[PDB]
Design a protein around this nucleic acid. Structure first.
Ligand SMILES: [Zn+2]
Lengths: 81, 36, 95, 98, 73, 109, 81, 99, 94, 106
DNA sequence: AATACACAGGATGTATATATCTGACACGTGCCTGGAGATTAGGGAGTAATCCCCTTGGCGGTTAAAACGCGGGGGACAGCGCGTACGTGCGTTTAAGCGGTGCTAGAGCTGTCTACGACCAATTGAGCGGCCTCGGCACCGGGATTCTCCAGGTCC
DNA sequence: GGACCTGGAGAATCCCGGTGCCGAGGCCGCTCAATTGGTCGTAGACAGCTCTAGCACCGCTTAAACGCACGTACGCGCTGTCCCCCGCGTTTTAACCGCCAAGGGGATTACTCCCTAGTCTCCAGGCACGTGTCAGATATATACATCCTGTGTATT
């Protein structure tokens, strides 16, 4: 666990953009996408670990993530609750 | 059987789930399809 | 081994009552379960707030009706209000 | 004599249709799981994750990225273009309120 | 005979026809007014798709009839 | 005589007594009336029946019998009021609707 | 009570534009702004009047307006509650 | 001879500074009150309003409109222009989620 | 018909921080609304945390976790420090 | 021979009133002892921060009283407070002075 | 001989100082409802102890996907010319706004009194967990149709 | 000669059968949570009264809205260039599926006891009125600060 943000490879971002409907992609989009994804993940995982620590647990469950997303305004259907 | 359409007014086959003319999807018993 | 309640059997019964020859997958059932839970919690919270505003201590069918009229769009709200009124009237006139 | 070569802009539309009809996960699972473990390390030492947790995180993140790219495409088309640039992403994130 | 064509767009196009007239002439009059060729024109009335080979009287079309036009491409 | 569940009495399928218990123990008020669970059960039943009926018609088109998340996703996003009600919801394994902007399409007559 | 939407005069829309930081304004912005304002007011007044109807009252108060705004993510400070 | 005439741009900037420095209602109060009464007339007849309710409605409406115009200006600047057009409002309201 | 608000406490805090400064009535109303909003947000988050954890009691730990979940960055750290100090002063004095 | 709990906690905000509001507010079946104290302390700190910033703003503007304009300025110029109050509008508050660079004649 | 560019002067606009006068804030007084203190008691939550399900680390092989390189075409971006659509300013026109008076509808409280919801104990059936199949759906294989794309013919 | 038109080749996707695995679906046994019956207190409906404040109307200033004229700057269309990204190819690389092994920690059960709900008594903190000074709003007069047009003249 040293540097894995680069694991979101260029073809993966291209595929996600294709599902988004984008025809042509400039060469500077990949760093921007990586930064945006990192920020989103940081927020959600911070909330999830806060819930996990309050419950005196050591394992992050699916309900922790669902609640973290629920408080952030993006509810998720298909994992419980 | 059949199901009339609120848009194209053309009767559609009972075992059809869209209008073969105006492409409007089959509506629910209570709520009818929109203008478009 | 410990009981864990859900809304599965009621969703399945309504599905069979609408589509006699159609099944459902596990993930789709989970999604419908979450949908029903979300609707319940939304309406209950709105009714609670609206009862507390008027300095009242009980929530009744009128509060649920007003919450439905607040939370749903037009046609959906109208049809849900009609369904609720019919259900309550049938429930009252039976012993 | 010349091998067949599609004109630029035709394989892209095919990819758009193909990925707009499917409902799979477009990111490799193992690198995303490693990224999740790296980010969560900065908050608590020696954490553990349920498989459902990682799956829910991945599904939510991909939905968010697809929505962002939709808005970016709208912004790029607004400026009389076809190619998306970081300006469009920044304008979308500014208007959305992030 | 006065007929109104209630196109799905929302325009009530009005034309003059004859009780024994063929559907082809009725279709051609719309092309005269709008420019839609008879090949691409679809006419809906009482859940029946009219054919150019038939006539208005064959479909039991009475006075002050209302028709609908659908573009199928 | 024999016991008769309140759900059967009201002509519903969803559990009136279970919803009554959830209302009672959910910290919503000091008291809960009698008709409130009945009204709530009717509303939830109607809102589930609409989605299930549309999803069934969608599934039959695809020459399938088993309902999957994709059918629900398409039914919700294509309806206007249903989309308005669920505008801030993400459905797992649902995908997106097919949509391409007109300017990106090639030359058309 | 007819055509009262026209009471929102062009100088007023220009004034509201200036406070947002705008320099040049096209000649077709005013109709768009009027439509936007009409839709927004329809939503808020609908919510306020249904709050008033539930209270068995025949007067729309400031608390009803604040509650209508609160349930739309538009919290207002400075009128109580 | 010729009266003093400012060039196009100076008076607009002057007004921008003026109305960004002040905190007063920019719509005449009585026409807005009449509009409020018109809109509510279609939901309940013989309704009555407290004055503070009308003031709250006006404050919220002005805040919303100022924010929308800010977003419209940003979108217009993105498209390499200085003027605002209806398509800018439409793009801002589409991206926000109001349509 | 005794209505109540937070006016006197906000005034006392203001005079504690700025001895020679006043406040208008509408600023008073805004501060009252701010205080009520903060109270309701934290109470609702603590209630949700109690319900999630299968408990029926709201304690200081629920309020601490709610404040951490609701306030950003430095605000949360300073609020947590203030709450801990207040509780540990209240406990030591019978 | 009664000492208020607010005085004991070292606080200026009420404690018994907040305890009553929690008890009757439908938040749980029970309310602990230190919960109202913690809540009151947090609210007092937030109010103190906002009032300090607004008072500094008014003094620099050559005033004695605080008006909503000063509150709006202090709130919107602070990143943490702006994030905490991202959904709230202040009546008679105005807006920050901000004009885009490309609109200026240079 | 030409043309730009800094300078000088007129000119609006804004910022500063000074007098005044009015209404909103700050303080005092009285009292009444709500917080504090003491005492009782039942259950919620802490805590030790046990079992086993699920998470983590490891190794091997198979192969699709990611990484690197190359050739060219469609698009991004700069530059220029036109024209028309807003911005600025001036002379009328309309209607908001301030002040005042008069009417009464409807909020807001107070006093009764009964129907309705909470609480408890017993008891019976609805709903959950574990099992055991089959038929829907996924995957493979093969051919058939649809959709691009460039190389020549011919007409304008 | 060049642009419009077409034909043939080629790649990609779709339709049709055929086989196989496992997840949905119905059953069986149990057990606990919904139901029935009775008791008891109070929340809420209903009526009556008081009095704030919302509505309507009038009358007069006077700033704001309105209509028109003129010109200039900006929006839009067109053209040309060049380098960046797309499509395809070949060589690496690490994701993925499969087993096996170990133990940390979620989940549950039983026991003890402290903390909070509920009650009554007492009294002072906090609120509603009432009153009066001064901070701020408003009017007036200088004085500084950007905006614009015209010109001298030096550079080219
Ligand atoms: Zn149809």
């Amino acid at each position: 666990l040293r540097d894995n943000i680069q694991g979101i490879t260029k073809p993966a971002i291209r595929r996600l953009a294709r599902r988004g409907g984008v025809k042509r992609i400039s060469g500077l989009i990949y760093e921007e996408t990586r930064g945006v994804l990192k920020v989103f993940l940081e927020n959600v995982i911070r909330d999830a670990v806060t819930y996990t620590e309050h419950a005196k647990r050591k394992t992050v469950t699916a309900m922790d993530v669902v609640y973290a997303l629920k408080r952030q305004g993006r509810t998720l259907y298909g994992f419980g609750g | 059987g059949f199901w009339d359409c609120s848009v194209c007014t053309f009767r559609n086959s009972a075992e059809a789930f869209k209008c073969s003319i105006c492409d409007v999807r089959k509506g629910t018993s209570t709520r009818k399809p929109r203008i478009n | 081994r410990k009981r864990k309640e859900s809304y599965a059997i009621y969703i399945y019964k309504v599905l069979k009552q609408v589509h006699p020859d159609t099944g459902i997958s596990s993930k789709a059932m989970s999604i419908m379960n979450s949908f029903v839970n979300d609707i319940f919690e939304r309406i209950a919270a709105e009714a609670s707030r609206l009862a507390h505003y008027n300095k009242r201590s009980t929530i009744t069918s009128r509060e649920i009706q007003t919450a439905v009229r607040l939370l749903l769009p037009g046609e959906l709200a109208k049809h849900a209000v009609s369904e609720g009124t019919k259900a309550v009237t049938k429930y009252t006139s039976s012993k | 004599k010349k091998p067949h070569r599609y004109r630029p802009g035709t394989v892209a539309l095919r990819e758009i249709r193909r990925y707009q009809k499917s409902t799979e996960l477009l990111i490799r699972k193992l690198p995303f799981q490693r990224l999740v473990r790296e980010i969560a390390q900065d908050f608590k030492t020696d954490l553990r994750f349920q498989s459902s947790a990682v799956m829910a995180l991945q599904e939510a993140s991909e939905a968010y990225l697809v929505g962002l790219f939709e808005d970016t495409n709208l912004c790029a088309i607004h400026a009389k273009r076809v190619t998306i640039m970081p300006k469009d992403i920044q304008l979308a994130r500014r208007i959305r309120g992030e | 005979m006065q007929i109104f064509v209630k196109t799905l767009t929302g325009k009530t196009i009005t034309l003059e026809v004859e009780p024994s007239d063929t559907i082809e002439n009725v279709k051609a009059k719309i092309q005269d007014k709008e420019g839609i060729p008879p090949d691409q024109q679809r006419l809906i009335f009482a859940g029946k798709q009219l054919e150019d080979g038939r006539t208005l009287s064959d479909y039991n079309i009475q006075k002050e009839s209302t028709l609908h036009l659908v573009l199928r491409l | 005589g024999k016991a008769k569940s309140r759900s059967n009495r009201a002509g519903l399928q969803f559990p009136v007594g279970r919803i009554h218990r959830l209302l009672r123990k959910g910290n919503y008020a000091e008291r809960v009336g009698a008709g409130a669970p009945v009204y709530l059960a009717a509303v939830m039943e109607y809102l589930a029946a609409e989605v299930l009926e549309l999803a069934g018609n969608a599934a039959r088109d695809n020459k399938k019998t088993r309902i999957i998340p994709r059918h629900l996703q398409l039914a919700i996003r294509n309806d206007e009021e249903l989309n308005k009600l669920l505008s801030g919801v993400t459905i797992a394994q649902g995908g997106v609707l097919p949509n391409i902007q007109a300017v990106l399409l090639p030359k058309k007559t």
